[PDB]
RNA sequence: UUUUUUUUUUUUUUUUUUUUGUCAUUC
RNA sequence: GAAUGACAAAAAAAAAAAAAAAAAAAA
């Protein structure tokens, strides 16, 4: 019921399955409430569904640490177990239909359902009963807390999605280990390395050389670092001395520039993705590139993908399991050394 | 709650207090449900009220025949008890707050409350304890199939409203008593003329010089019924010989001139009252008038008034009671016969 | 393109897949078209799909006559193969999804693909290849207007849709063989009755004893076709003397009565189904009904369903084969004869 | 009219009463004007209200010092006089009707006829006549910058709102004595304390102690001000150590946590209230709370609050009078200490 | 084409002309598309064109350094030649009409046809083969990085608009020299001050003058610069002291101020133009005035303006020359010294 | 004879946030 | 000596539009 939905909101944040129902009007995509006889906004339908219906699927959402979006995403999950997963950079559900949440969406109430076959559930083993679900399911995707009998684990993110902030849980477990069965057998899913999901305004680091590349100058971090050839000047540093911007498809590198100097960033693809694409205009300088594919690699890790490379082509493109996706670097090296070396995925 | 309104309305054609909840879907002022996994319209917003709020209204309107809105309007009926009167003519609710109907548009759960003491509230005699209620009320009108002990009623029109058409009952009783109170104390209604609310492509005759007016030509009918000297030519048949359209006053020369020859009428007021103002132009003469008021008259009614009348006054502006309320008419006469009879103030 | 779906609307009134431009506005969910330099409006969505993609799957709907979207809803159809068939009774599309048609609504490019196998996919024989698709899909229904070697003929109603009207062919053939598979094996398709899909206003009987039904008095065509004891005052004919309206549950007795006495359709769910509810309410004697279930059978079909019923048996549910489906009759009988003869749960 | 008053706000910000016309144009609950040539973006309708009624009330908004809408909605006040409350926190108007301001959503045209005597009507006495206006009304709320004869004076917050920022007044006066009259009698308002309507990102101390609080650590603050047995540990500072969140329920702890580590306030019920509650997500251990109620009172008001409890009830609900209204907290005691001390019902 | 743009628009930011389509989705004045099965969107309409039309034309925008718009007002530029010039200020293009740009908005495809005579073109000298088209042009304006043979350069500000972003071009070159031509006549623009176009949050200063007055305070700022009697404690610095703002008519006092205590800015009218008129309400003190006029002129141009002025007048209208356009400055001025030089008409 | 797959192979067009040349303009 | 614009040179890859060929596919 949208009055029951909207009762709980107002009265616990989130549907709980409380029972009660307040006034409720529903006008210019937007749901408001009657509070003290004045009408107070409750949510503003910033997706393709119905008002009500996405009301009610954002009502309904998990608040509980989940995967990130992209996570999903890549893992090839197509819909979610009893569960909704909000992605929070679309304000829009992750999943187009649901099972056993919404009547709108719902293609099935029970992820058994011969309908839920040929997608890939995603199942949380933090739910009881979840586990045994995921071991009939034909095609399905599973992260728990701990270890499952049977099954040999993934090791996923450090970090997951907790109510739309990205964070390594302390007092809440963050880190899953991930399984996937496709067509009824289980796949063992490849060695990956993990984007950190950090931010531009809050970037913080997470190792010992990203302290140094935050707080020395170019040379000597390379210099320090034994990173001469691969082009660290412009790849993570950025070339900002053209019309055209060069580079600065790392966002550590982003980072630096823009405690020094702040830039625009427009995001003309407003999703969640390993590899984001930007339109960056340098505000200082006034180099702009209407492309800037970045990726959230770890430093160290990004170190270790390029100087895992064969330095002696003109021209590769390079795969990298990242995310539990294959993203596809185009190497750029000349003369025994690397000229550029950038994600091109989205 | 929405979804029980809609299913509902889907099982039974309106809100019949039955409990389940069927999948709805709002979107551009409008309520879809799914029916075979299609979403199929059940109520376009057409009202100033949000959606949600007009579909519940539209659910739980007064499905028995209703004593028609422009009767409401000119006792002065502010608000309904414990009903919804639908105003078909403007496709929205006849009263802006309801009371014990809809959350969002009620003032009050019953109409004993002191919010609704000043308000003149409608109380529906064939509703069980509605004439209790009323005589309780310090001010509310009332309508009964019958006669109320201590109370002299009010013969009220023999048509009634039954789901948005208009007709004199057979099946069911459609002639109510009519009582108002004011401050407390049960008022006397006047003697008054009643329109009888027809429309121009099903005008029916209800009276043998009804029937005769449609059937006998001008000057046979004027000399028949001795209506020489009224201006009968020009005040019921109407003047199409100039641009500008002349009299044409009563719906029956209307629907006589529409017999012979349609033409087209704007009514740019889309509302319910006793005199109905339209923007008349014939499509045979090309004779056009931008406001013409236009009243539903019983012709043997129009007849009694326009006899009853002093005929030796140049300008005179009478004062006919009409529904309830007052309709001032204007009165030209010149050499003892009447030159101009129609609604002032046009 | 939505330019070219517009060029192709304007120059041919549906997509015939030209080449060519226009300038498209869209606003206000409707698609504008500017023409000598003022904008033309081309299509109105009232779907709850997108306003562009509504356009185009109306622009690509089949013109050619199309089996009644009543006969593919119960033949079990979920989506058409490289074909958009277009439900007018809703003004949207008779199902959710295409094969190959839009790109926002398309699940597969071809229909047998591995995600259209659970569905049971419409194929039209008239179009090259399709019997081939069809003999290949795990569930399929197939029409044609001629024999399919291999396979049993269903003939179907004579009557099917062409632009939005049924109407029986004389220039056209409308009058297809259907087959339907389900899991991979062909399936013998019932023995059924069919709806005529006949207006109330535009009624035209299709047989002598309607002709005599609709011409003769209820008395003379009871008499002349022995159906006494067979409750048809009620049941057909109707009763309009209580306040609550009794029987007209066939839709020629409807069209009887309405040919004397107008009365109101009040369709709350307007969609296409064998079983139609309508909130009737008898305009001259003011018999109103919330849900009446009308059926539009042949009253040849009716009176020999009613004839070969058991009338020594006080309440039965009788299930009747009817446009592909089971349609569920209430049977009150007394005394050995009927007294109500009704579609079941209304 | 609209186009007066678009005229007012383009030449003066507000609408004054000047005379003149600019071109208006209405498209998607938005108000634009055309300036130069091209249109310019007046105002955007984010009320239930119509977009020209919104608008007319924005620019007919109060722009002197008002009180806030919370205390203003805790005295009762239902309609204002002659002037309109703009709720900022909402962006919609404080009150659904108005006096004498808008025709749309008048009620009366002067605060003394008949309608306004049930409703408590504010009435600003910084206006010429309306101190003699609220003498005579029989339920109104006067505020005047000095004394009134024969009225005994209720000081009110040092804070009051103007244009939206909540400040305390050095070239203005934001100070108002707070009178109220109900049926005719004036009621002494009690005692109360007030809250100081301060921002989590620009939060300012406003007493020494609350300098302590900022700068000293939690036990050294603790230590110093006698506040041991109080649970200043987790009522004021918060607990982050479990997954759910505990404490945080004065907004100064809140700022305090904000200062080292930024966290996401949620709020689901965007209005003005003495008591607010926040989806409070903790971005550095993951602590999270669905429900947080957060009161801006002072530190020291809280301080001498708590202080003034008795320690030995194992559970107790405590009636403090804030903001003229009384806020319900709810206190546990264990061995002589205070465990909790959090808004009851949250 | 729609699906064509926002498929340039998904993989380059904007409409590079590149071949290809992508699923696209019209709804609530949104343009969305389907990446990986869900819709993201693209761009919301905050104009008053078509959400399509406007979409086509920000996709086309210029991403190359653009004059600000307000330059191109103050020239009278009415349309430009084969380029959208898109005013971030107002979120919607600069110009009503274009030049073979968007079909629904265009009023030819070349600007030599007749159309465009009257109109003043603005021509960029950096595309290739418009400095031609400029010179056969009745009305143009015309921007290039160089000199142009056989015209006289107007040498303009040193800052440009890079989408979005007003920046003094170190990379790209932001100065462009002017040319203008009304009904075929080269004129000589005048010479004219240039507002610096910035930030209250990001104010940087541009001369020794802005650093002086950034770091000292009122008295020693304007003893060293010998601004004793120009009034500078009031028509820079601001007055405070009543309710009533006092001077602050230039943004670099707004910026020292908002350094110390921030403030509230609510801009009504959000447009480019030379002159600024704000809402200005302090927070700290109290002080709003409801129009006040900001230029943000150099501190030594403004300097020289006021030192330029005749003070032995009481009343006078000084004309300055800003922007290509003469601003309207009211001098105000009482023994011989500077009393108030707020611009015309706040 | 139709169909999806496993795809491979051939050609056309488009593209890639690499470097490099020629023409063109502007210092 | 540079920048920009219009293009080409190198290397790899992607997208489709045309096919052929195949292991499968059901006919």
């Given at each position: 019921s949208l009055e029951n939905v909207a009762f709980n909101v107002v009265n616990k944040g989130h549907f709980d399955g409380q029972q009660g129902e307040v006034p409720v009007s529903i006008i210019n995509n937007t749901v408001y409430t009657k509070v003290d006889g004045v009408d107070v906004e409750l949510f503003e339908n910033k997706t393709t569904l119905p008002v009500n219906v996405a009301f009610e699927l954002w009502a309904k959402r998990n608040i509980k640490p989940v995967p990130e979006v992209k996570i999903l995403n890549n893992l090839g999950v197509d819909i979610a177990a009893n569960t909704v997963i909000w992605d929070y950079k679309r304000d829009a559900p992750a999943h187009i239909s649901t099972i056993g949440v919404c009547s709108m969406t719902?293609?099935?109430?029970?992820?058994?359902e011969t309908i839920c076959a040929p997608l890939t559930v995603f199942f949380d083993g933090r739910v009881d009963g979840q586990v045994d679900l995921f071991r009939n399911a034909r095609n399905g995707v599973l992260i728990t807390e701990g270890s499952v009998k049977g099954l040999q684990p993934s090791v996923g993110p450090k970090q997951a999605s907790l109510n739309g902030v990205t964070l390594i849980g302390e007092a809440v477990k963050t880190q899953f280990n991930y399984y996937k069965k496709v067509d009824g057998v289980v796949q063992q899913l490849p060695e990956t390395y993990f984007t950190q999901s950090r931010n531009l305004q809050e970037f913080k680091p997470r190792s010992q050389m990203e302290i140094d590349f935050l707080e020395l100058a170019m040379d000597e971090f390379i210099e320090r670092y034994k990173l001469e050839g691969y082009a660290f000047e412009a790849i993570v540093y950025g070339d900002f001395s053209h019309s055209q911007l060069g580079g600065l498809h790392l966002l550590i590198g982003l980072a630096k520039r823009f405690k020094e100097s702040p830039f625009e960033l427009e995001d003309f693809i407003p999703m969640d993705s390993t590899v984001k694409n930007y339109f960056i205009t340098d505000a200082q300088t006034g180099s702009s590139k209407c492309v800037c594919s970045v990726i959230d690699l770890l430093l160290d890790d990004f170190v270790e993908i390029i100087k895992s490379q064969d330095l002696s082509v003109v021209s590769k493109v390079v795969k990298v399991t990242i995310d539990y996706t294959e993203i596809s670097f185009m190497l750029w090296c000349k003369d025994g050394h690397v000229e550029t070396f950038y994600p091109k995925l989205q």
């Open positions: 719902d293609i099935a109430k029970k992820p058994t």
